[PDB]
Amino acid sequence: SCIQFTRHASDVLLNLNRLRSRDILTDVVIVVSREQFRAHKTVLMACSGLFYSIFTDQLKCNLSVINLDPEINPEGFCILLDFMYTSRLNLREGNIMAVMATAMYLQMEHVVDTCRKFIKASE
Amino acid sequence: SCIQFTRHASDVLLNLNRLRSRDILTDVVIVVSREQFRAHKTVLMACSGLFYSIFTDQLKCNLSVINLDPEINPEGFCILLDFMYTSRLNLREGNIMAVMATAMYLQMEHVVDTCRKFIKASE
């Protein structure tokens, strides 16, 4: 018999992004080819199958620095990190291959699906 | 020129609640009249003006235990904590006064607004 506030999840995510922009309570640095990205472990886990697996590991859950595979493009990661905190994906002809490859590695199934669809439309 | 994934914010919140239910990466205990509630500081800040003020304080941001005012009802807090992680509010005739008072203390403006409206309808 609950009532539901429609905008609550969006408002929560907006506030989480405000904390990220001000670097408040960020607890991990993600290193991508020497580029560094600060974030909240819980948000990373909530959005990515890879971060979920990493931070549920009894040893890795305590790491303050995570280094990604050297094949990962920092711009592709930056676009996906922005998507995690906003629901908005900056998908462009020039970045779609790097974004799809990064989303496959991060295990972000819905992003992989839209990249596959946008690539299929261009062929 | 971004695209947006409609269900992303809801999916993030659903995963954050799954982490809460399994006690994964919870970093604070909220004490309410001897009852204890584990949660994520970032989610508490994202939902409440009071927790936002507490965890942006340079000394309180480092506390693992927060004790609420003894007038706060643990059931009212439990209902609001559930709302924070799900967007669903279990508002009933028997709990509405305790829920409104707790939401006013926690500074959860949208919850206070619906309680005021539901109380006004009953008079």
């Binding site: 609950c2 009532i3 539901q4 506030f5 429609t6 | 669903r88 509010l89 619906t114």
Partner: peptide, 4 residues
């Protein structure tokens, strides 16, 4: 607010 809505009835979910």
């Amino acid at each position: 607010w809505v009835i979910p």
